[PDB]
Design an enzyme around this catalytic site. Structure first.
Site, short mmCIF file in Angstrom:
data_model
loop_
_atom_site.label_atom_id
_atom_site.label_comp_id
_atom_site.label_asym_id
_atom_site.label_seq_id
_atom_site.Cartn_x
_atom_site.Cartn_y
_atom_site.Cartn_z
N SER A 47 -97.21 -36.98 -52.62
CA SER A 47 -96.83 -38.29 -52.10
C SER A 47 -95.14 -38.48 -52.16
O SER A 47 -94.61 -39.15 -51.49
CB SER A 47 -97.16 -39.26 -52.74
OG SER A 47 -98.68 -39.46 -52.82
N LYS A 50 -92.82 -39.32 -49.29
CA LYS A 50 -92.90 -40.94 -48.71
C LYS A 50 -91.77 -41.66 -48.97
O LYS A 50 -91.27 -42.22 -48.13
CB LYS A 50 -94.21 -41.37 -49.31
CG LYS A 50 -95.51 -41.25 -49.02
CD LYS A 50 -96.56 -41.72 -49.58
CE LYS A 50 -98.13 -41.05 -49.57
NZ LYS A 50 -99.05 -41.16 -50.42
N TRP A 82 -106.59 -44.21 -50.72
CA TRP A 82 -105.56 -44.86 -51.15
C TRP A 82 -104.68 -45.37 -50.23
O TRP A 82 -103.44 -44.95 -49.85
CB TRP A 82 -104.76 -43.66 -52.32
CG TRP A 82 -103.80 -44.31 -53.29
CD1 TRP A 82 -102.63 -44.90 -52.71
CD2 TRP A 82 -103.91 -44.17 -54.56
NE1 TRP A 82 -102.05 -45.33 -53.86
CE2 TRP A 82 -102.58 -45.03 -54.82
CE3 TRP A 82 -104.81 -43.86 -55.47
CZ2 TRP A 82 -102.52 -45.07 -56.38
CZ3 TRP A 82 -104.74 -43.95 -56.91
CH2 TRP A 82 -103.46 -44.52 -57.40
N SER A 107 -97.46 -45.82 -52.78
CA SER A 107 -97.65 -44.62 -52.13
C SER A 107 -98.98 -44.86 -51.16
O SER A 107 -99.88 -43.64 -51.29
CB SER A 107 -98.01 -43.85 -53.60
OG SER A 107 -97.99 -42.28 -53.15
N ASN A 109 -101.23 -44.47 -48.24
CA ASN A 109 -101.14 -43.11 -47.42
C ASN A 109 -101.51 -43.32 -46.00
O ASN A 109 -100.88 -42.76 -45.24
CB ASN A 109 -102.68 -42.50 -47.72
CG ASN A 109 -102.64 -41.37 -48.94
OD1 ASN A 109 -101.16 -40.84 -49.07
ND2 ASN A 109 -103.26 -41.23 -49.82
N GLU A 145 -104.24 -33.84 -46.25
CA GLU A 145 -104.44 -32.61 -46.01
C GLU A 145 -103.07 -31.65 -46.93
O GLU A 145 -103.40 -30.67 -47.39
CB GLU A 145 -104.22 -32.11 -44.54
CG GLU A 145 -105.57 -32.25 -43.67
CD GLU A 145 -105.92 -33.79 -43.37
OE1 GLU A 145 -105.03 -34.61 -43.17
OE2 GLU A 145 -107.10 -34.26 -43.47
N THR A 212 -93.38 -41.16 -56.90
CA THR A 212 -94.07 -40.42 -57.50
C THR A 212 -94.94 -39.47 -56.39
O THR A 212 -94.84 -39.74 -55.08
CB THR A 212 -95.36 -41.03 -58.13
OG1 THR A 212 -95.90 -41.91 -57.19
CG2 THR A 212 -94.79 -41.76 -59.34
C1 LIG Z 1 -106.51 -40.14 -53.41
C2 LIG Z 1 -104.87 -40.41 -54.18
C3 LIG Z 1 -104.03 -40.85 -53.68
C4 LIG Z 1 -102.83 -41.32 -54.41
C5 LIG Z 1 -101.62 -41.57 -53.39
C6 LIG Z 1 -102.72 -41.13 -55.82
C7 LIG Z 1 -101.57 -41.30 -56.64
C8 LIG Z 1 -100.45 -41.96 -56.14
P1 LIG Z 1 -98.89 -40.69 -56.26
O1 LIG Z 1 -98.53 -40.17 -57.51
O2 LIG Z 1 -99.55 -39.69 -55.12
O3 LIG Z 1 -97.98 -41.33 -55.50
C9 LIG Z 1 -101.61 -41.16 -58.03
C10 LIG Z 1 -102.74 -40.68 -58.60
O4 LIG Z 1 -103.13 -40.51 -59.44
O5 LIG Z 1 -103.92 -40.47 -57.85
C11 LIG Z 1 -103.97 -40.58 -56.54
C12 LIG Z 1 -104.98 -40.40 -55.61
C1 LIG Z 2 -102.07 -42.34 -38.10
C2 LIG Z 2 -102.29 -40.89 -38.08
C3 LIG Z 2 -102.89 -40.11 -38.84
C4 LIG Z 2 -102.79 -38.61 -38.67
C5 LIG Z 2 -103.63 -37.82 -39.64
C6 LIG Z 2 -102.34 -38.21 -37.50
C7 LIG Z 2 -102.34 -36.82 -37.17
C8 LIG Z 2 -103.20 -35.78 -37.97
P1 LIG Z 2 -104.96 -35.58 -37.47
O1 LIG Z 2 -105.48 -37.09 -37.35
O2 LIG Z 2 -105.02 -35.15 -36.09
O3 LIG Z 2 -105.62 -34.78 -38.31
C9 LIG Z 2 -101.65 -36.40 -36.02
C10 LIG Z 2 -100.99 -37.34 -35.08
O4 LIG Z 2 -100.48 -37.20 -34.21
O5 LIG Z 2 -101.26 -38.73 -35.65
C11 LIG Z 2 -101.79 -39.05 -36.59
C12 LIG Z 2 -101.76 -40.26 -37.11
#
Ligand SMILES: Cc1cc(C)c2c(CP(=O)(O)O)cc(=O)oc2c1
Ligand SMILES: Cc1cc(C)c2c(CP(=O)(O)O)cc(=O)oc2c1
Ligand SMILES: Cc1cc(C)c2c(CP(=O)(O)O)cc(=O)oc2c1
Length: 270
Positions: A47, A50, A82, A107, A109, A145, A212
């Site tokens: 992350s 970001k 998340w 963070s 997603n 991914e 992070t």
């Molecule tokens: C699936 C997930 C997603 C995130 C963003 C985290 C984060 C926050 P990040 O450190 O990536 O900013 C901490 C963590 O422990 O688990 C996660 C699990």
């Molecule tokens: C909001 C968003 C999220 C994703 C993951 C995409 C992707 C990757 P995918 O969904 O195809 O695995 C490409 C894109 O062009 O727009 C996105 C917008």
């Protein structure tokens, strides 16, 4: 060279106890002194991209007035794991600025992916980093991914040194205009996800902003920060980890301990 030699042994002991690799680059922006440990190796961004994403949004806002206020609507399919802020506004939408704050400070997603789309995807963010002189950073994929953290895979990686150099340029240097620079700093200062990482090494009376990253496999997690000690110039630092086995767990305590060693190597009492 002298400060890097000074911390080599404690860093080796820390990463051996951790069971993986620790990468650190820390810069005292006053003297220019630096501490390096595996600072040129690639580590997965997770992350941590970001933060740079929000800086890229802010850079564009210098060219497109009202960009930050633009409302963005999205569907349930955007709500990947998340997405703690964006899921609450699914039925309403959020502004570009709100998405950026959520991406940096929670963070989030979905927010990160929505902003990536506005910027032209991973290659667009990579292009922004090239434009500030970072030839190391590369983003290749989207959340989640990009968490794969495969050993030896350069996709979605940078080095601790390049992360620190770019962070310095964006928060303290001239890569952003002054208002945008302060907004980026303010977003980093308001981060909620890093209390157990670099911040755990920073005294309460020092200002700090951070971002992070946690990939969740291969012992891979990280944090970068700008730290403002009182009475001296700010420090910029990046702490990244990985480990050889997919089931190896990351450690927040190791990140905090590495940050402590970096600050001690710079002679910053605290
Ligand atoms: C699936 C997930 C997603 C995130 C963003 C985290 C984060 C926050 P990040 O450190 O990536 O900013 C901490 C963590 O422990 O688990 C996660 C699990
Ligand atoms: C909001 C968003 C999220 C994703 C993951 C995409 C992707 C990757 P995918 O969904 O195809 O695995 C490409 C894109 O062009 O727009 C996105 C917008
Ligand atoms: C997403 C993004 C944002 C910016 C500001 C750039 C820049 C600056 P530009 O020359 O376009 O004004 C260079 C670039 O190549 O990629 C970017 C990507």
């Amino acid at each position: 060279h002298m400060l890097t030699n000074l911390v080599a042994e404690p860093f080796a002991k820390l990463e051996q106890d951790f069971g993986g690799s620790i990468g650190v680059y820390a810069m005292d922006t006053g003297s220019g002194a630096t501490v390096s440990y595996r600072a040129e190796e690639r580590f997965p961004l997770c992350s941590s991209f970001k933060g740079f994403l929000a800086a890229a949004v802010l850079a564009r806002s210098q060219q497109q007035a009202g960009l930050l206020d633009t409302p963005i609507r999205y569907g349930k399919n955007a709500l990947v794991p998340w997405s703690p802020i964006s899921e609450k506004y699914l039925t309403t939408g959020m502004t570009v600025a709100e998405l950026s704050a959520a991406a940096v400070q929670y963070s989030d997603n979905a927010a990160a992916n929505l902003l990536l789309k506005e910027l032209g995807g991973p290659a667009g963010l990579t292009a922004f980093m090239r434009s500030i002189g970072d030839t190391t950073f590369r983003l290749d994929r989207w959340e989640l991914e990009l968490n794969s953290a495969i050993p030896g895979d350069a996709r979605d990686t940078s080095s601790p040194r390049a992360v620190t150099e770019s962070l310095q340029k964006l928060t303290l240097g001239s890569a952003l205009a002054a208002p945008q620079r302060q907004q980026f700093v303010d977003w980093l200062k308001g981060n909620t996800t890093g209390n157990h990482r670099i911040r755990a090494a920073v005294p309460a009376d020092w200002a700090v902003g951070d971002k992070t990253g946690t990939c969740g496999v291969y012992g891979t997690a990280n944090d970068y920060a700008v730290v403002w000690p009182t009475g001296r110039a700010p420090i910029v630092l990046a702490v990244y980890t990985r480990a050889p086995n997919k089931d190896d767990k990351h450690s927040e305590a190791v990140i905090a301990a590495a940050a402590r060693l970096a600050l001690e190597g710079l002679g910053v009492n605290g």
